[PDB]
Amino acid sequence: RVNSDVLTVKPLRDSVKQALKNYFAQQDVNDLYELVLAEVEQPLLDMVMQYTRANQTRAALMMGINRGTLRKKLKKYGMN
Amino acid sequence: DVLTVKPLRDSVKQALKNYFAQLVNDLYELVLAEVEQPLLDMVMQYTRANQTRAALMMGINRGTLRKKLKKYGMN
């Protein structure tokens, strides 16, 4: 069972699996979560800010997080 | 540069563009679910369902790994 099917590029999840499958094809790894998280959070923050015209309050409300959390993530990726 | 399909991030951007055209207050959780689930699937597949090895590869403790698995009903 999967949460939703509203993210397609077909489903986004399929793209994540292939990227991981391709990655595994090549070896110790110890930061795969952060690796994936950063690769997904950056584009998400970018698109949400574009959709909301950089209105941080609107962006956080759309994402379902508070203002401070959004700003923290934005800073992490030098997007502040 | 390590996660490609080309970079994975480009697929996330396109996915969101398509989604926005269909229009919300749970976008973060919604995307996290679509990303974490497959990640957990692939790592557990890679380690033959060995949670310790999976947790170590991901860089999270075993307790956190098990919490995520449960969150997504992957017990």
UniProtKB/Swiss-Prot annotation, chain A:
<dbReference type="GO" id="GO:0006351">
    <property type="term" value="P:DNA-templated transcription"/>
</dbReference>
<dbReference type="GO" id="GO:0032993">
    <property type="term" value="C:protein-DNA complex"/>
</dbReference>
<dbReference type="GO" id="GO:0001217">
    <property type="term" value="F:DNA-binding transcription repressor activity"/>
</dbReference>
<dbReference type="InterPro" id="IPR009057">
    <property type="entry name" value="Homeodomain-like_sf"/>
</dbReference>
<dbReference type="GO" id="GO:0031421">
    <property type="term" value="C:invertasome"/>
</dbReference>
<dbReference type="GO" id="GO:0032359">
    <property type="term" value="P:provirus excision"/>
</dbReference>
<dbReference type="Pfam" id="PF02954">
    <property type="entry name" value="HTH_8"/>
</dbReference>
<protein>
    <recommendedName>
        <fullName>DNA-binding protein Fis</fullName>
    </recommendedName>
</protein>
<keyword id="KW-0963">Cytoplasm</keyword>
<dbReference type="GO" id="GO:0042803">
    <property type="term" value="F:protein homodimerization activity"/>
</dbReference>
<dbReference type="GO" id="GO:0043565">
    <property type="term" value="F:sequence-specific DNA binding"/>
</dbReference>
<dbReference type="GO" id="GO:0009314">
    <property type="term" value="P:response to radiation"/>
</dbReference>
<dbReference type="GO" id="GO:0006355">
    <property type="term" value="P:regulation of DNA-templated transcription"/>
</dbReference>
<dbReference type="InterPro" id="IPR002197">
    <property type="entry name" value="HTH_Fis"/>
</dbReference>
<comment type="similarity">
    <text>Belongs to the transcriptional regulatory Fis family.</text>
</comment>
<dbReference type="InterPro" id="IPR005412">
    <property type="entry name" value="Fis_DNA-bd"/>
</dbReference>
<comment type="subunit">
    <text>Homodimer.</text>
</comment>
<dbReference type="GO" id="GO:0001216">
    <property type="term" value="F:DNA-binding transcription activator activity"/>
</dbReference>
<keyword id="KW-0010">Activator</keyword>
<keyword id="KW-0805">Transcription regulation</keyword>
<dbReference type="GO" id="GO:0009295">
    <property type="term" value="C:nucleoid"/>
</dbReference>
<dbReference type="GO" id="GO:0045911">
    <property type="term" value="P:positive regulation of DNA recombination"/>
</dbReference>
<keyword id="KW-0238">DNA-binding</keyword>
<feature type="DNA-binding region" description="H-T-H motif">
    <location>
        <begin position="56"/>
        <end position="75"/>
    </location>
</feature>
<dbReference type="GO" id="GO:0003677">
    <property type="term" value="F:DNA binding"/>
</dbReference>
<dbReference type="GO" id="GO:0000976">
    <property type="term" value="F:transcription cis-regulatory region binding"/>
</dbReference>
<dbReference type="GO" id="GO:0005829">
    <property type="term" value="C:cytosol"/>
</dbReference>
<dbReference type="GO" id="GO:0044374">
    <property type="term" value="F:sequence-specific DNA binding, bending"/>
</dbReference>
<dbReference type="InterPro" id="IPR050207">
    <property type="entry name" value="Trans_regulatory_Fis"/>
</dbReference>
<feature type="region of interest" description="Required for the stimulation of HIN-mediated recombination">
    <location>
        <begin position="10"/>
        <end position="26"/>
    </location>
</feature>
<dbReference type="GO" id="GO:0000786">
    <property type="term" value="C:nucleosome"/>
</dbReference>
<dbReference type="GO" id="GO:0001046">
    <property type="term" value="F:core promoter sequence-specific DNA binding"/>
</dbReference>
<comment type="function">
    <text>Activates ribosomal RNA transcription, as well other genes. Plays a direct role in upstream activation of rRNA promoters. Binds to a recombinational enhancer sequence that is required to stimulate hin-mediated DNA inversion. Prevents initiation of DNA replication from oriC. Binds to hundreds of transcriptionally active and inactive AT-rich sites, approximately half its binding sites are in non-coding DNA, which only accounts for about 10% of the genome.</text>
</comment>
<dbReference type="GO" id="GO:0051276">
    <property type="term" value="P:chromosome organization"/>
</dbReference>
<keyword id="KW-0804">Transcription</keyword>
